[PDB]
Amino acid sequence: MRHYEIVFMVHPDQSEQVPGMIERYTAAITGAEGKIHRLEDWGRRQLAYPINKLHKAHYVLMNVEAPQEVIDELETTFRFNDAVIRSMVMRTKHAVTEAS
Amino acid sequence: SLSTEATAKIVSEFGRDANDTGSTEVQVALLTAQINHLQGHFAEHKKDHHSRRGLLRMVSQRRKLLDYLKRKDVARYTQLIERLGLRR
Amino acid sequence: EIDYKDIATLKNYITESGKIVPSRITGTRAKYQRQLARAIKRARYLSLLPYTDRH
Amino acid sequence: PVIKVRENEPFDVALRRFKRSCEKAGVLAEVRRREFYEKPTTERKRAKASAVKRHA
Amino acid sequence: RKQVSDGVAHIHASFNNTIVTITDRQGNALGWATAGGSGFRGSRKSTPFAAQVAAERCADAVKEYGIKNLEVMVKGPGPGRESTIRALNAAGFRITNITDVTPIPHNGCRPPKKRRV
RNA sequence: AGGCGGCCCCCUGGACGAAGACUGACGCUCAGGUGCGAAAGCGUGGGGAGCAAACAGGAUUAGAUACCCUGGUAGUCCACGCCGUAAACGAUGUCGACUUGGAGGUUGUGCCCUUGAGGCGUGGCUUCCGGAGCUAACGCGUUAAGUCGACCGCCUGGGGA
């Protein structure tokens, strides 16, 4: 099964949904026979320039071990979710959980 | 194209157990399993021509192995072309 | 470079006006500089490295 | 881009910095690449011609 | 008029001329002058002291607001953008730093063909 | 191969670094035949920033249907075909064998206390100098323009063409 790198930000105005938001994804990968390899809340983070408004923002990243559709189905929730402006997936090359 | 799990399917059934992938049945079934996939991908788009250049090699290489199959063992050969369902 | 989330070091690859500095002056591996752009243009919409100071 | 004013500093000292600031690219020099219409075959050999010039 | 003490001199230093504009923080231009609108025609319009005199003509009629600071706007190569700033030095102005204002196209419009002269 | 460069997913495809099994000549070449196929243009449905043919205006000139300057149609961008041609060149047919050298790069990969970015092998590609050799020379010159094996392709003064 492919491993993927899932990084998505919840707007600082949306900082509370992160506990509610991720667990649904936790049920989202746990459902598809895959699991989580690394789940860290980096917290709100400053951004040098506004994305059509506002600086700074809240970051969340999580690595997955799950099939393409749960990868693909998960990417569906993000587009609709205006709270999660961007998450883009990178690489598999085995799963790792480290660094900061 | 085809997934590794779906690639694993074709080797066993058209081969001697799961380990006979050098059997032309594995490729042709793999190839037969593939022409239909891209046929699906080519059914849409119609704009993936250069990948259709990936399309023909399957059809032509499919012709090659079956015609290769004909000389080696027809009793085996007749099995697959019906088994792969082409020609009239 | 590796990731778009660490704009702190990504900033050394940008001039003060937001145009990405040539990696030739910065050096870095030939492949590594590409990862910078992947974290910059597309991740723009994530607000990683500023356009410039106009507004 | 903000070019700010400090206290007690003469406009002459930055005078050197003013042109150094945009010389790094050159506003009009890169404007030189939208003034007219050029074939891409020009740049590719422009890269080719410039590439040859770049071999000490 | 109105006292601002913090203006903006936008220097547009064309290949033929060097035009500088005075404006306030929101960008609402207060004043503006050109090197070529200062005597020089044709060849002489695009000369540094032509840009220097443009600053003389641009540097005036903008402190009538009582401007005491003004951030500057660099622009392109050419005769001005250096002499204009120098003439601005003559008035005893202050400037912290100078930042590049270049729009760097990332492969936009098809380039220009050299003047086959 | 043309040709391929902002970022991410599907798929591909090709390509090379270390051992272990597999079958055994199952190989190379190809008339005919079969696919692809740089750029422009056109047909057809859209789009439409730059612009820029043609074409309008202003300058030089003796004259300037141009160069110099303002416009400017087509088109250049998303969908189906055709057209299949170009300095599509390394002006260097294809596959397999032999051969002083020199010096780098990059890319695997073992080795070596990396005792440190290093030292010592094992492959690939490629960059510059050049023995021999050979060439009309020009220069090429272990990726041969030096020494051999198979297939295919091609030329017979100039113009006309």
Residue extents of the structural domains in chain B: 1-88
User: Is nucleic acid strand F under 7 Å from D33's C-beta?
Assistant: no
Contacts C52 to D, Cβ<8 Å: 1
E58 within 8 A of E20, measured Cβ to Cβ: yes
How many Å lie between the alpha carbon of C24 and the closest alpha carbon of chain A?
A: 24
**A76 strand F contact, CB < 7 Å:** no
- Residue A59 in domain: yes
Pairing of strands E6-13, E69-73: parallel
The kind and range of the H/E element at B70 are helix B49-72
Beta bridge pairs of residue E23: E8, E29
Which DSSP helix (H) or strand (E) runs through E49?
helix E48-59
A88 Cα distance to chain centroid = 8
Give the Cα separation of D50 and C2 in Å (integer).
Answer: 32
Chain-chain contact of C52 with D1 (C-beta, under 8 angstroms): yes
| Euclidean distance between CA atoms C9 and C35, whole angstroms | 13
**What is the CATH number that goes with domain B1-88?**
1.10.287.10
The set of chains that have 3 or more CB pairs under 8 A with C is: A, D, E
Q: What is the largest CA-CA distance in chain D?
A: 53
| Total domains present in chain C | 1
Query: Would you say A62 and A22 are in contact if contact means Cβ atoms under 8 Å apart?
Result: yes
Residue labelled with tokens 């799963």? A95
Question: Roughly how many angstroms between the first and final C-alpha of chain D, as a whole number?
Answer: 37
The answer to whether C and D touch (≥3 CB pairs < 8 Å) is yes
Q: Three-state SS string across chain A, please?
A: CCEEEEEEEECHHHCCHHHHHHHHHHHHHHCCCCEEEEEEEEEEECCCCCCCCCCCEEEEEEEEECCHHHHHHHHHHHHHCCCEEEECCECCCCCCCCCC
Count how many domains chain E has. 1
Chain E residues touching C15 at Cβ < 8 A = 100
Question: What's phi and psi for E54, nearest 5 deg?
Answer: -55, -45
Mode of pairing for the β-strands spanning A3-10 and A57-65: antiparallel
CA E25 to chain centre: 16
d(CA E47, CA E54): 10
Q: How many CB pairs under 8 A join A and C?
A: 39
By residue range, what is the domain housing residue A1?
A: 1-92
Phi, psi torsion values for A10, nearest 5 degrees: -100, 125
Hunting for tokens 């667990």 — which residue is that?
A23
Q: Which of residues 1-56 of D touch C (CB under 8 A)?
A: 1-2, 24-25
Q: What is the DSSP letter of E94?
A: B
Question: Would you call A83 an interface residue with chain C, using a CB distance cutoff of 8 Å?
Answer: no
CA–CA separation, D6 and D19 (whole Å): 18
Question: What is the rounded CA–CA span in Å between residue D33 and residue D50?
Answer: 15
Nearest residue to E81 via CA among D35, D23, D4: D23
Q: How far apart are CA E101 and CA D1, in angstroms?
A: 5
Residue A97 tokens read as: 């959980």
- Chains near A with 3+ CB pairs less than 8 A apart are C
**Rounded to an integer, what distance in angstroms lies between the CA atom of residue B59 and that of residue C5?**
46
Query: Which residues numbered 22-51 in chain B sit less than 7 A from strand F, measured from CB?
Result: 22, 46-47, 49-51
Q: How far is the CA of E47 from the C1' of F149 (A)?
A: 75
Would you call B25 helix, strand, or coil by DSSP?
A: helix
Cβ contacts from C onto D, under 8 A: 8
Q: Which residues of E touch C52 (CB under 8 A)?
A: 101
Between D5, D25, D37, which is nearest E104 by CB? Answer: D25
Give the number of other Cβ atoms within 10 Å of residue E106's Cβ: 8
Nucleotides of F under 7 A from a protein CB: 5-13, 22, 34-37, 49-52, 67-69, 79-81
Give, in Å, how far the C1' of F9 lies from the CA of D35. Answer: 40
Q: Which domain holds residue E39?
A: 1-117
Residue E68: closest CA among E2, E3, E9: E3
Specify the DSSP class assigned to residue E73: E
Contact (CB<8Å) C43/A88: yes
Instruction: Report the candidate in A70, A60, A69, A62 with the shortest Cα–Cα distance to residue A90.
Output: A62
Which helix (H) or strand (E) is B41 found in, with range?
Answer: helix B24-43
For chain A, the domain total comes to: 1
User: Residue by residue, what is the 3-state secondary structure of C2-52?
Assistant: CCCCCHHHHHHHECCCCCECCHHHHCCCHHHHHHHHHHHHHHHHHCCCCCC
Count the helix, strand and coil residues of chain E and give each as a percent rounded to the nearest 5: 20, 20, 55
Structure resolution, Å? 4.2
Burial label for D23, CB within 10 Å (0-12, 13-18, 19+), is middle
Task: Report which of residues 54-113 in chain E place their beta carbon less than 7 angstroms from any atom of strand F.
Answer: 106, 108-110
Angstroms from C31 CA to nearest CA on chain A: 15
